[PDB]
Every structure is written in C-alpha cells, then in structure tokens.
Write an enzyme that holds these catalytic residues in place. Sequence first.
Site, PDB file in Angstrom:
ATOM      1  CG  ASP A 199      -2.972   9.130 -11.000  1.00 26.36           C
ATOM      2  OD1 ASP A 199      -3.096  10.185 -11.661  1.00 26.36           O
ATOM      3  OD2 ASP A 199      -3.635   8.099 -11.226  1.00 26.36           O
TER       4      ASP A 199
ATOM      5  CG  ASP B 214      -8.557   5.954  -0.824  1.00 25.36           C
ATOM      6  OD1 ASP B 214      -8.520   5.562   0.357  1.00 25.36           O
ATOM      7  OD2 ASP B 214      -8.050   5.317  -1.762  1.00 25.36           O
TER       8      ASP B 214
ATOM      9  NE  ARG C 135      -5.173   2.478   1.097  1.00 26.39           N
ATOM     10  CZ  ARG C 135      -6.174   3.112   0.497  1.00 26.39           C
ATOM     11  NH1 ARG C 135      -6.043   3.543  -0.752  1.00 26.39           N
ATOM     12  NH2 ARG C 135      -7.317   3.305   1.133  1.00 26.39           N
ATOM     13  CG  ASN C 136      -4.119   6.576  -1.878  1.00 25.84           C
ATOM     14  OD1 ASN C 136      -3.672   5.646  -2.566  1.00 25.84           O
ATOM     15  ND2 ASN C 136      -5.354   6.576  -1.426  1.00 25.84           N
TER      16      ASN C 136
HETATM   17  C1  LIG Z   1       0.712   4.443  -4.416  1.00 21.28           C
HETATM   18  N1  LIG Z   1       0.324   4.864  -5.770  1.00 21.28           N
HETATM   19  C2  LIG Z   1       0.461   3.947  -6.817  1.00 21.28           C
HETATM   20  N2  LIG Z   1      -0.502   3.028  -6.929  1.00 21.28           N
HETATM   21  C3  LIG Z   1      -0.479   2.097  -7.885  1.00 21.28           C
HETATM   22  C4  LIG Z   1       0.547   2.040  -8.823  1.00 21.28           C
HETATM   23  C5  LIG Z   1       1.592   2.968  -8.720  1.00 21.28           C
HETATM   24  C6  LIG Z   1       1.553   3.934  -7.716  1.00 21.28           C
HETATM   25  C7  LIG Z   1       2.720   4.902  -7.610  1.00 21.28           C
HETATM   26  N3  LIG Z   1       2.600   6.061  -8.504  1.00 21.28           N
HETATM   27  C8  LIG Z   1       3.606   7.016  -8.559  1.00 21.28           C
HETATM   28  N4  LIG Z   1       4.794   6.730  -8.040  1.00 21.28           N
HETATM   29  C9  LIG Z   1       5.776   7.613  -8.028  1.00 21.28           C
HETATM   30  N5  LIG Z   1       6.975   7.295  -7.430  1.00 21.28           N
HETATM   31  C10 LIG Z   1       7.465   6.011  -7.109  1.00 21.28           C
HETATM   32  C11 LIG Z   1       6.654   4.982  -6.623  1.00 21.28           C
HETATM   33  C12 LIG Z   1       7.200   3.772  -6.228  1.00 21.28           C
HETATM   34  C13 LIG Z   1       8.580   3.600  -6.330  1.00 21.28           C
HETATM   35  C14 LIG Z   1       9.401   4.642  -6.787  1.00 21.28           C
HETATM   36  C15 LIG Z   1       8.843   5.838  -7.169  1.00 21.28           C
HETATM   37  C16 LIG Z   1      10.904   4.473  -6.899  1.00 21.28           C
HETATM   38  C17 LIG Z   1      11.353   3.607  -5.711  1.00 21.28           C
HETATM   39  C18 LIG Z   1      10.487   2.364  -5.645  1.00 21.28           C
HETATM   40  O1  LIG Z   1      11.021   1.309  -5.329  1.00 21.28           O
HETATM   41  N6  LIG Z   1       9.163   2.389  -5.953  1.00 21.28           N
HETATM   42  N7  LIG Z   1       5.614   8.835  -8.505  1.00 21.28           N
HETATM   43  C19 LIG Z   1       4.493   9.178  -9.109  1.00 21.28           C
HETATM   44  C20 LIG Z   1       3.441   8.280  -9.161  1.00 21.28           C
HETATM   45  C21 LIG Z   1       2.138   8.684  -9.810  1.00 21.28           C
HETATM   46  F1  LIG Z   1       2.231   9.927 -10.445  1.00 21.28           F
HETATM   47  F2  LIG Z   1       1.829   7.738 -10.789  1.00 21.28           F
HETATM   48  F3  LIG Z   1       1.147   8.763  -8.829  1.00 21.28           F
HETATM   49  S1  LIG Z   1      -0.397   6.363  -5.961  1.00 21.28           S
HETATM   50  C22 LIG Z   1      -2.139   5.994  -5.637  1.00 21.28           C
HETATM   51  O2  LIG Z   1      -0.265   6.684  -7.350  1.00 21.28           O
HETATM   52  O3  LIG Z   1       0.058   7.146  -4.860  1.00 21.28           O
END
Ligand SMILES: CN(c1ncccc1CNc1nc(Nc2ccc3c(c2)CCC(=O)N3)ncc1C(F)(F)F)S(C)(=O)=O
Length: 269
Positions: free
Chosen positions: A150, A132, A136-137
């Site tokens: 993740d 994938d 978007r990831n």
């Molecule tokens: C796209 N993804 C998601 N899909 C589903 C649910 C959540 C995530 C995002 N997950 C994560 N997001 C961030 N950083 C982050 C993300 C968004 C925002 C902000 C910081 C602040 C500014 C804002 O406004 N939003 N760091 C780490 C992670 C991880 F470790 F959980 F991956 S994914 C597949 O995990 O890449």
Amino acid sequence: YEIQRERIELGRCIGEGQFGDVHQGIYMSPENPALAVAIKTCKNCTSDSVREKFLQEALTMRQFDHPHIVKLIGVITENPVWIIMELCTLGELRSFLQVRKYSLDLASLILYAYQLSTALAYLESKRFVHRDIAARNVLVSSNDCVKLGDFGLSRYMEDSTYYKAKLPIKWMAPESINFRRFTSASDVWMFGVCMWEILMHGVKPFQGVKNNDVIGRIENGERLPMPPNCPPTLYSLMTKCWAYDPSRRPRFTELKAQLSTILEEEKAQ
Ligand SMILES: CN(c1ncccc1CNc1nc(Nc2ccc3c(c2)CCC(=O)N3)ncc1C(F)(F)F)S(C)(=O)=O
Ligand code: NA
C-alpha cells in the site's frame, strides 16, 4: 466501492499505520467465495480533514490495476472508516527472505525482481513517481508472487504522512539526496538497490555506514558490492540503474526485458 461492515470478519493485527492499526481479515463478498484481506483502520477519522486524507489513500490505490501491486477491494465510510485491501498471505518480503536465506533458489529471487519491474513499468506508464522503492515496501502473496505494498502505508512516498519515528538516504538517487529531485530515473536507482536487497536475502544496504558518508562514496564512484551467487549479468544490470547521471539510466520496460532474459538463462541452469 462501498463495503458493509457486517461482511468483514476482523482478525489479528499485522502492523501499525499512520492513521491506525492494520489487521488481517476475511471479506464475505456477496454471492462469491470469501477473500483474505488486509484492513487499514483509522483512529481519528471523526475529524473531516483526517477522514479526507485517509480516504485519499484508497483513491490513490483505486487508480491502479496490476497483478504485482496490492489491489483496493473497497472502503467502509461509516465511523470508524476502514480501507479494505487484498491480503498478501505470507507477509513482508524482508522477513520471508531472512527465513530462507540460501534455501531460496536463484530463479525465485530473480523472479521477484522481474515481478517488481513489471509493477514499476506499469507505474511509469501512468507517469507516477513512487519515491520509496525498497524491500520493506514489498509483500509476499505466495512462494512465486511478490507485490508492491500500500502506497499510503509506505513511509516515504510523496503523499504519505509520517509515522511517530526521516529519509531513506541509502536507497536514494544522488539528485534526490542533494536537491530533492524525484523522477522515473530516481525510481530506477532505488529499484537497483531493491534488487540488491533481494539478492542479499533481506540485508539492508550500507550497514554500519553513516547517512552523511553515503553521498561522498557514491560521488567517488563506489557502489553496493556484487551479492554472493548473484549472476554477473544481473549485477551489471544493477550498476546500470546506478549511473550517476539520471539521463543514462535505463527505463523500467528495458529492465523488465533484461530480467526476463536473466531469469530464462538461470532456469536453463
Ligand atoms: C509493509 N507494509 C505495511 N506497513 C504498515 C502496516 C502494514 C503493512 C502491511 N500491509 C499489508 N500486508 C499484507 N500482508 C501481510 C503483512 C504482514 C503479515 C501478514 C500478511 C501475515 C503474516 C504476518 O505475520 N504478518 N497484505 C496487504 C497489505 C496492504 F494491502 F495493506 F498493503 S506495506 C507499506 O503496506 O507494504
Ligand atoms: Na459501508
């Protein structure tokens, strides 16, 4: 790898996962500076089968240690179960690219493609097939650092559960669309699409084209066009990722080496 819940300060919701909401937060690490973290929560982890599936996602990330792949910080196995991951402060890559559009230097866009190629060469070194690879990831830790997000939260990976909302056809290799074949070579095809997405400032491939029409176009030799301002050497590299025969596609170590050359050629104007 166990974390105590009194050391977490839960912040705003940053997204929704299959098992529950994902929050931004702070981890007050013992005798260390506090870390900005992402917290995956689980709504129905009282059920043993759900709890074990959720905790398997933390074990999947625990096996990887790379600067361009989000790191597992720890888990809280008390009810409600939480997985603590490193936070990529600036969020999702597509949103970041869509804000800046042409104001992002070409050297930054090539750097993002290079950083992802190092994380994908690392996954290939572990014989791990992603399935994938898409913008978007990809997350943004700073202006000069992107990371693969993740694996559990990624919608179409092998061990990933489905969200309420089937296949990312416009990113997939022909053998994956036709026969569900997923290898390191099909990951290379997806990475060429991801590089195209980065050079297109977060625009999705094949917009306005039906999924069923994509394989016919690919079999007729049609490919995604050269993005505006993309260096011809970088576009040639993308077309090599899109060789119809998977045995003719380069591996990630070669893509990494060639991207480093492209990046240094752009930095020398
Ligand atoms: C796209 N993804 C998601 N899909 C589903 C649910 C959540 C995530 C995002 N997950 C994560 N997001 C961030 N950083 C982050 C993300 C968004 C925002 C902000 C910081 C602040 C500014 C804002 O406004 N939003 N760091 C780490 C992670 C991880 F470790 F959980 F991956 S994914 C597949 O995990 O890449
Ligand atoms: Na705990």
